């Protein structure tokens, strides 16, 4: 699984997933599934950010935490929007709202609600993608055009196929459920 991750995602994404895991004392060599999940989540964050006009999104995910909060503070004090209790993934200068992005190997609506309750914030938009091509957004708003979202979905499904092809997919779909329970 480890070797698969390093040739599936780019070094920058891998590099940042490693840091993210290390910051919390977790080891990518042992918890290889969570390693893959983090690379995936980052890739989706980046793609999502790229989907818009050039300066539309501030990227909050994939930074050192302290600098992230600083940028969040800047946005809140700048635009009037409420400070969220949990670190979001993006800010949308176009729509004037923070975005949390989810990637589940489980049901889109299940994951959506686990998130929605935890944040407990009306302002933060929520956007969930599955490895099977479904997506769910708050108020049925997807932010991006159909083209952008389709590229994301395609990419996720490619990751699933690539894992399945090597026998790593079952173990990976297992991990999330076990983590939840
Ligand atoms: O699993 C995901 O989708 C994450 O986005 C995970 C993440 O950011 C993280 C950060 C620090 C430690 C462990 C996971
Ligand atoms: O799951 C996700 O989509 C996250 O975006 C998770 C995340 O940011 C995080 C940060 C710190 C600890 C655990 C998860
Ligand atoms: Mn995040
Ligand atoms: Mn997220």
Residue numbers in the entry: 1 to 50, 50A, 50B, 50C, 73 to 196, 196A, 196B, 196C, ...
Provide the publication's sentences verbatim.
The RdRp is a heterotrimeric complex comprising subunits PA, PB1, and PB2 that associates with the 3′ and 5′ ends of each RNA genome segment. Translation of viral mRNAs by the host ribosome requires 5′ capping, and the necessary mRNA caps are cleaved or “snatched” from host pre-mRNAs. This “cap-snatching” mechanism begins with the binding of PB2 to the cap of a host pre-mRNA, followed by the cleavage of the pre-mRNA by the endonuclease functionality. Two groups found that the endonuclease activity resides not in PB1 as previously suggested but in an independently folded N-terminal domain of PA (PAN). Here, we present crystal structures of PAN from strain A/Vietnam/1203/2004 (H5N1) in complex with six known or predicted inhibitors that allow us to precisely describe their interactions with the PAN active site.
Compound 2 has also been structurally characterized in complex with the La Crosse virus endonuclease, and it engages the two-metal active site in the same fashion. However, in the PAN complex, two copies of the molecule are bound in the active site. Molecule A engages the Mn2+ ions and molecule B π-stacks onto molecule A in a parallel fashion via the phenyl group and the planar side chain. This arrangement was present in all four active sites in the asymmetric unit. The carboxyl group of molecule A forms a salt bridge to Lys134 and hydrogen bonds to metal-coordinating residues His41, Glu119, and Ile120 (carbonyl) and to H2O122. However, they did not observe the second bound molecule, and we suggest that this is due to the higher concentration of 2 used in our structural studies. To confirm the stoichiometry of binding of compound 2 at the higher concentration, we carried out ITC experiments. Analysis of the data strongly supports a 1∶2 molar ratio for PAN∶compound 2 (N = 1.86), and an alternative analysis using a sequential binding model also supports the second bound molecule of 2, albeit with a nearly 100-fold lower affinity. These ITC analyses are therefore consistent with the structures in both studies where one or two molecules bind PAN depending on the concentration of compound 2. Compounds 2 and 3 occupy pocket 3 and interact with Tyr24, which is a highly conserved aromatic residue.
